[PDB]
Amino acid sequence: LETGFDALANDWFTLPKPDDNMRREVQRDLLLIKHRAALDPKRHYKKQRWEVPERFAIGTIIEDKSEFYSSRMNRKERKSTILETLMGDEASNKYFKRKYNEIQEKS
Amino acid sequence: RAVVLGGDEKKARSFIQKVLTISKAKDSKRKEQKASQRKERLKKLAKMEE
């Protein structure tokens, strides 16, 4: 019987920080969320004092293939900035042009 | 500071300025109304207190 026992004796959740001297496109987008109440006459929001967050990201939505008709934007309609899409909407510009005028005569 | 902007940049800057003026007018109008209701509310409490 041989035994070696005797012989053994002897971060994932952190968002990107916006860069200082941030692009003008980002600032114009952040202003739109801050003043989103005035974009549409028919849409109203809860009162919120929204301050620019210390960390944030700009993202693009991705729809499921089943939402090809219901909730998809055409490629031409898509724009790099939230502002640029808003200008494209013809109904929005008509309301802004009309509403912008009335403030001017009153002023 | 003096700067030189292209056509597309000018359109974006004009669009923002239009929005802020509309937002400023809408915000003030809501303020004045709720301020008035405070005045009407106060004039009624004076009856309640008296």
């Binding site: 003008r24 600032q27 | 500071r1 003096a2 700067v3 030189v4 902007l5 000018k10 800057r13 923002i16 300025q17």
Partner: peptide, 11 residues
């Protein structure tokens, strides 16, 4: 910052 900047040499 748009208020800070002013546009010149326009066409």
């Amino acid at each position: 910052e748009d208020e800070d900047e002013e546009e010149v040499l326009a066409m």
